[PDB]
C-alpha cells in the first residue's frame, strides 16, 4: 500500500531500521511494517513493568500506597526523579509514575524488584498472552540495543497488541487501567516523537525508548477527536554503536500513518 511505500522510503531515507505497528481499534485493522523483526524495546519496556504491578495491586488493594525507600547505591545512570528521593521513601505508585513519565531508570529497577526479577515482569507479559516480549536484564544494562541480541526485545506487532489490552481491553481492573492511562497521558518525554507526526487536537498517552545503537522507540495510544483510538509502536534503531537519537524519524513514522487515515 501506499502506507508501505512511504514507510519503506522513510526507512531507507534514514539509514536505520524501522519498525511500526498501527492497530486501528475501529475496525481491528492493522498496518505492520517488520512488525515481527525484534527491536530492542529500551524504556518502553517500562509500561509492562509498571502494568504488573497495577495487576498485583488488584489483589493488594493497597499495594500502590506501599513505601519504599531509595538509598544511593540503588540509583543507576538516569534517576530524574528518584534522585529527589534518595535517603527517602517512594511509593510503588510513586515510582510508576516516575518510571513511565520521566523514565526513571531506578524506578524501573524497583518495580522489577517488586516483581520479582526480570522473570516476573516476562510472567506477566506471558500472563496477559504475549508470547514475544522478553525482559532479561535490569537498568541501565537492557539498553545495550545489540545488533542480533534478542535480550530484552519484542516485536512491534506485539507490543501493540499487548498495549491494546493493557489501556483499552481489559489485561486489568478498571481502575488500574484508568490509574495506567492516566500516567501515560501525562508522559513528559514524549513531545518530539510520536506527538510531534499527529494533529495538536489529538490526546497521546506514550512511553519512549532510547538505547545504545541510536535506539529511538515511542509507543503510543491515541485517541483522536471524534474516532476510535489507535495504537502505534514505532521502534527504530541504527547500525553504529554511538548514533544519535532520530526521534524526527519517529514523528515522521507518525505523519505517514496519519495521513493514511
Ligand atoms: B529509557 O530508554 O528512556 C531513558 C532511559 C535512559 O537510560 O532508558
Redesign the pocket.
Known sequence: SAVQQKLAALEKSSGGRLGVALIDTADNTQVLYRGDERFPM???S?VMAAAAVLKQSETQKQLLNQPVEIKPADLV??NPIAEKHVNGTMTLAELSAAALQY?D?TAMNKLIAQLGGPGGVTAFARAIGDETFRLDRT??TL?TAIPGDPRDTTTPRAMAQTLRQLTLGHALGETQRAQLVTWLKGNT?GAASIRAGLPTSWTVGDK????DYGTT?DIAVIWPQGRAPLVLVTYFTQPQQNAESRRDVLASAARIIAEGL
Open positions: 529500551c524504556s518502553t517500562k545512570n538516569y523514565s531508570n537498568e541501565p539498553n518525554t519512549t525508548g532510547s538505547g522507540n
